[PDB]
């Protein structure tokens, strides 16, 4: 996009190494981010430090938007780099000037906000309506369709730890192990540690 | 002013109480704005049980999620709680108003942001809390809303056990049992016609 190139001209770009934290929950929000390269996880936590992953976000995604529309808000979640990342940043105040000049850039942001609300509402449904087995089976399916899934004789090979699965579906590493064993017994997957083949 | 200008481009209509304004799966081509009344946003499981994702009220946009990409479906049901007066405008015409004054899109997007914050908090509650914890957090959330009333013992709220159940994802009977327990632990009063949540 000329429109994205223009926007990015007004930003300053910074590099975050894998596993660094871009955004901490509770911080005062005054800036917008945009992922030029790399991927992140958006995380929230329990009273006990238990993590739940709300979303992954990737190249092309805005981050830090939820504070833009009313002053004095706090970041709603943690954002942690899943890989090395390159991230453009701009102040809300400069971004609002860009909006005035060309509201197409707010349309692009708002389109992502709408999709997130859809996807997060679908997550609420999954958590409310599906048992942990159904959530795990749905998670493996979705991971198998991701761009990073390797093709396999029997289906798609994915790379994900039980910990990560637990953080997505909302259960312990141990509950994940018990259910993965069930799914292999049922001849639906194979599991070799962090490697899982989902059968087509 | 801005609002007054926007409503002049809309058609306004009345929906009686209990009438469904938006059905999940319908083609999304139009945006709505609540001039008067209150609605619930609902999803359904495979057994017809409804969960309430949100209550929305006068000044809220509804049906916004399809605005940014063509050929989408309505993501949820939206049902009138009270009778509603609702302004409606095509997505095409709204996209024209945005070029006049993108504050109208800022207002809509502020609401999407809030909704994503609320719905993300719901994801955590379902992941991290048991049904009692979820009910307790729901009472706390209701106590914080502007329509709660100050009470000598805390905040007084107005909500049926059926509504709580649809918010939390449990039966009305389960709610009634758990409220009696919470009252017994001296956290709420619920034996009256409303609920008072202590220390609120
Ligand atoms: N449910 C969600 N889906 C996708 N991204 C989210 C979600 N919740 C929060 N975030 C992102 O996490 C960021 C945390 O900081 P902000 O609240 O400023 O902006 C937030 C969003 O960019
Ligand atoms: N309800 C839950 N019970 C246990 N772990 C949870 C829950 N929700 C999210 N999690 C997270 O998922 C993680 C899976 O790996 P761990 O068991 O090490 O730690 C777990 C928590 O951080
Ligand atoms: N989690 C949510 N919170 C508040 N409103 C929502 C939520 N999910 C869906 N909606 C509203 O429900 C409407 C359903 O139709 P749309 O998807 O067009 O637009 C949607 C929003 O206005």
Residue numbers in the entry:
A (entry chain A): 9 to 208
B (entry chain B): 10 to 209
Copy the relevant paper text.
We therefore used the co-ordinates from a high-resolution crystal structure determination of the full-length cAMP bound CAP homodimer to construct an ENM for the apoprotein as well as single and double ligand bound holoprotein states. The thermodynamic parameters for wild-type CAP demonstrated an overall favourable entropy change and unfavourable enthalpy change on binding the second molecule of cAMP consistent with a previous report. A previous study of the truncated CAP ligand-binding domain demonstrated that binding of the second molecule of cAMP was entropically unfavoured. The difference in thermodynamics between our experiments and previous experiments using the ligand-binding domain alone is therefore likely due to the contribution of motions of the DNA binding domain. The closest distance between the two cAMP molecules in the CAP dimer is 9.5 Å (the distance between the N6 atoms of the adenine ring). The extent of negative cooperativity in CAP is generally small (ΔΔG = 0.3 kcal mol−1). The allostery observed is unlikely to have microheterogeneity as an alternative explanation as all CAP proteins crystallised as a single superimposable structure.
CAP is a 210-amino-acid transcription factor that binds cAMP generated by adenylyl cyclase in response to the phosphorylated form of Enzyme IIAGlc (phosphorylated in response to the phosphoenolpyruvate-carbohydrate phosphotransferase system). cAMP-bound CAP regulates the transcription of over 100 genes crucial for carbon utilization through its binding to a specific promoter region and recruitment of RNA polymerase. Previous studies of the ligand binding domain of CAP demonstrated negative cooperativity between cAMP binding sites in the absence of structural change within this domain. We produce coarse-grained models that describe global low-frequency protein backbone motions of CAP and show a strong correlation between negative cooperativity for cAMP and modulation of the delocalised normal modes on ligand binding without a requirement for a spatially distinct physical pathway or conformational change. We demonstrate experimentally that altered connectivity between backbone elements in CAP can give predictable alterations to cooperativity for cAMP binding through altered mode amplitudes.
